[PDB]
Amino acid sequence: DNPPDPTPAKFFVPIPSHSWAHGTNTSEPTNTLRLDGGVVGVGRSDDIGTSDTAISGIIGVYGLLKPFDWNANDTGRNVGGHLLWSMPVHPQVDKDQVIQVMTQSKLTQYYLPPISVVSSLYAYTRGSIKYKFLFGNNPRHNARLLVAYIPGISSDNRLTLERARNSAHVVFSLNEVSEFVFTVPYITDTMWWPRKYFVAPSYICMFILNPLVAMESVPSIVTIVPMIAAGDDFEVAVPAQPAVGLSRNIDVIY
């Protein structure tokens, strides 16, 4: 028998390939180069963990920012109210508080914390940030600092201690304490804040409250190392053109 099959011919719309954008939650028709044919993957065990790429784990790690000094013997800058350090608060840290390595005619290489690389891969981002400050000192130094978080400010023009005490802030006393974390709030009229490399949504600043003391037996300089990691609620939004490239080849054609 060779019965005829008269069933009508369906329409169909030719296209050269599958989705270029889709990365998840789908199948991908493809021509695999295997001896086998079928859904096949490379073997694993405990010798080889699972993939470590879950964002919250990468961005939980602190990266380091430019360190800076108190000079306790400095009579000028060591006073009530003098502001030591400050910067706009957003995941991509500001280009001037990162450690840079500059080359002649090449690109400048920035050391960005892991939150700042991840946040360059996405278009919007939101949630709290952790700033862990790390003081080089010994039991004999002492001071107090007021670290305030000012929502809706770009730069320090109108910023003094007497004003900064009107926002969310934390008073910390470095009396035999070498590290503290300041989890800054996230206060913004919008739900996702766009990337920066714009303005940052807020600002952070650090004022001497009680000046630094020390003696003739102890070093007079206290170095501070600021470090930044994402909080527990921090989230990224829409994949975009990465703001940063690799430094493997830093040659550039203007």
Binding site for a copy of itself (CB under 8 A): 1-19, 21-39, 238-239
Asked if 81 touches other proteins (CB under 8 A), the answer is: no
> CB-wise, 19 or 217, nearer to a copy of itself?
19
Asked if 192 touches other proteins (CB under 8 A), the answer is: yes
The window from 19-27, 71-79, 138-146, 208-216 that contacts other proteins (CB under 8 A) reads 19-27
What is the spatial distance between Cα 50 and Cα 201, in angstroms, rounded to a whole number? Answer: 36
Q: What is the largest CA-CA distance in the chain?
A: 109
Q: How many CA atoms lie within 13 A of 13 on its CB side?
A: 1
Q: What is the DSSP letter of 85?
A: E
> CB-wise, 115 or 143, nearer to other proteins?
115
The window from 45-53, 153-161, 177-185, 209-217 that contacts other proteins (CB under 8 A) reads 45-53
Of a copy of itself, other proteins, none, which one sits near residue 117, judging by CB under 5 to 8 A according to partner kind? other proteins
Q: How far is the CB of 188 from a copy of itself (least distance, A)?
A: 16
Footprint (CB under 8 A) of other proteins, residues 103-142: 107-112, 114, 117, 120-121, 123-124
What is the spatial distance between Cα 186 and Cα 200, in angstroms, rounded to a whole number? Answer: 11
Q: How do strand 68-71 and strand 221-230 relate by DSSP bridges?
A: antiparallel
Amino acid (one-letter) located at 111: Y
Q: How do strand 168-173 and strand 68-71 relate by DSSP bridges?
A: unpaired
Footprint (CB under 8 A) of other proteins, residues 222-241: 237-241
Q: How far is the CB of 241 from other proteins (least distance, A)?
A: 4
Give the residues after which the backbone of the chain is interrupted, taking a C-to-next-N distance over 2.5 angstroms as a break.
197
DSSP three-state, residue 101: strand
Token representation of residue 237: 């939004």
Contact residue for other proteins among 157, 190, 216, 217 (CB under 8 A): 190
Contact residue for other proteins among 55, 58, 84, 168 (CB under 8 A): 58
Of other proteins, a copy of itself, none, which one sits near residue 64, judging by CB under 5 to 8 A according to partner kind? none
Asked if 102 touches other proteins (CB under 8 A), the answer is: no
- Beta strand residue intervals within 99-238, DSSP E: 100-101, 109-110, 124-126, 129-136, 142-151, 168-173, 179-184, 193-194, 202-213, 221-230, 235-236
Which residues contact other proteins by CB under 8 A? 4, 13-21, 23, 30-35, 40-42, 47-53, 57-58, 61, 95, 101, 107-112, 114, 117, 120-121, 123-124, 190-194, 197, 237-248, 250, 252, 254
